[PDB]
Amino acid sequence: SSQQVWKLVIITEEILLKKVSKIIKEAGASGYTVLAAAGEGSAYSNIKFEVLTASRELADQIQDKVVAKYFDDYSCITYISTVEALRAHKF
Amino acid sequence: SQQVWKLVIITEEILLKKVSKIIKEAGASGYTVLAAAGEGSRYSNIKFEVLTASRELADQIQDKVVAKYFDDYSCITYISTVEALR
Amino acid sequence: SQQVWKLVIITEEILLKKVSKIIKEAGASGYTVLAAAGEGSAYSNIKFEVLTASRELADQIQDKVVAKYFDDYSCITYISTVEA
Ligand SMILES: Nc1ncnc2c1ncn2[C@@H]1O[C@H](COP(=O)(O)O)[C@@H](O)[C@H]1O
Ligand SMILES: Nc1ncnc2c1ncn2[C@@H]1O[C@H](COP(=O)(O)O)[C@@H](O)[C@H]1O
Ligand SMILES: Nc1ncnc2c1ncn2[C@@H]1O[C@H](COP(=O)(O)O)[C@@H](O)[C@H]1O
Ligand SMILES: [Cl-]
Ligand SMILES: [Mg+2]
Numbered sequence: 001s002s003q004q005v006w007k008l009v010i011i012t013e014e015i016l017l018k019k020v021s022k023i024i025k026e027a028g029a030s031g032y033t034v035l036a037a038a039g040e041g042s043a044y045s046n047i048k049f050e051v052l053t054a055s056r057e058l059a060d061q062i063q064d065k066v067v068a069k070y071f072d073d074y075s076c077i078t079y080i081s082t083v084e085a086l087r088a089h090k091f
Numbered sequence: 092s093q094q095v096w097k098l099v100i101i102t103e104e105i106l107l108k109k110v111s112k113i114i115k116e117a118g119a120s121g122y123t124v125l126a127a128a129g130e131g132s133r134y135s136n137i138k139f140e141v142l143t144a145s146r147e148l149a150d151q152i153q154d155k156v157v158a159k160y161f162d163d164y165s166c167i168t169y170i171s172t173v174e175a176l177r
Numbered sequence: 178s179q180q181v182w183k184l185v186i187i188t189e190e191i192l193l194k195k196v197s198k199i200i201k202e203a204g205a206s207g208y209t210v211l212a213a214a215g216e217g218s219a220y221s222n223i224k225f226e227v228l229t230a231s232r233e234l235a236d237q238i239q240d241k242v243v244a245k246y247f248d249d250y251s252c253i254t255y256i257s258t259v260e261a
């Protein structure tokens with residue numbers, strides 16, 4: 001059977017790659033995945049972070065700090081969803 | 092905290108401009124595209140991700156792209172829900 | 178529309194061929210793969226997405242890739258539902 005984990009998505013400009021990774025890591029996430037992305041909002045010059053955490057509270061802390069620091073001045077969207085992972089694994 | 096719909100459309104790279112036009116014309120605030128490869132029934136393809144506050148616009152955009160390109164082009168599509176801010 | 182299951186596997190690019198074989202030999206109708214980078218416990222990784230008509234098929238694919246590769250390679254895997 002399975003354990004609930006939270007998946008935090010942050011899509012932002014590529015220039016924020018180092019700062020946002022450091023925020024994810026200093027908040028205690030076990031890792032993150034980055035994908036190269038393009039898009040339009042309101043080539044592949046955006047980055048999509050996906051951060052998995054078994055703590056909904058850790059996902060909120062990361063999202064809150066990235067939104068406070070960079071949402072005003074940088075193209076940034078963010079959202080959260082749940083996924084199921086194997087009980088034996090650690091997120 | 093609001094519930095939002097995520098529409099994924101995986102199709103051939105060559106449809107990039109035409110599908111982006113369908114998404115923008117239906118009134119979606121934007122979209123994300125990623126490079127992809129894969130196998131199916133019929134790097135090569137593009138994955139669209141479109142977030143829409145209403146399920147109706149998600150379905151609307153899906154209807155259009157499917158009608159116009161499904162039977163002629165490599166093309167899969169699905170919808171999930173996510174939690175966003177505002 | 179109907180509920181389907183989406184299996185994600187994130188692993189090293191060196192396992193591409195061998196994970197795709199597990200996927201197709203298990204009876205999945207297909208798979209998608211995206212280049213990825215990241216850190217755990219640049220774009221050296223790949224993310225599989227496998228849509229399956231049943232949970233059990235997603236579970237059997239995940240059980241096999243994990244049993245073969247989780248201990249010696251980078252292997253993140255999780256499952257969610259979508260409507261198609
Ligand atoms: N409705 C949407 N659906 C999916 N992705 C979006 C949407 N709106 C914005 N984005 C993504 O967020 C990026 C930045 O948004 P913005 O800050 O509005 O420029 C875009 O380039 C897209 O990658
Ligand atoms: N079961 C599946 N799971 C994930 N992606 C799929 C699946 N079937 C097809 N695809 C994707 O859709 C593309 C085109 O599908 P097709 O029209 O069946 O050739 C493939 O190259 C894959 O990227
Ligand atoms: N908590 C996480 N959230 C998102 N992606 C992760 C997470 N942990 C690991 N990853 C991804 O999985 C890859 C392998 O992780 P590892 O198995 O710890 O080397 C990493 O390089 C990331 O792409
Ligand atoms: Cl940065
Ligand atoms: Mg600035």
Ligand SMILES: [Mg+2]
Nearest residue numbers: 085086089254
């Ligand atoms: Mg797992």
Ligand SMILES: [Mg+2]
Nearest residue numbers: 084085086256
């Ligand atoms: Mg799982």
Ligand SMILES: [Mg+2]
Nearest residue numbers: 101209226227
């Ligand atoms: Mg997919």
Ligand SMILES: [Mg+2]
Nearest residue numbers: 089252253254
């Ligand atoms: Mg795992």
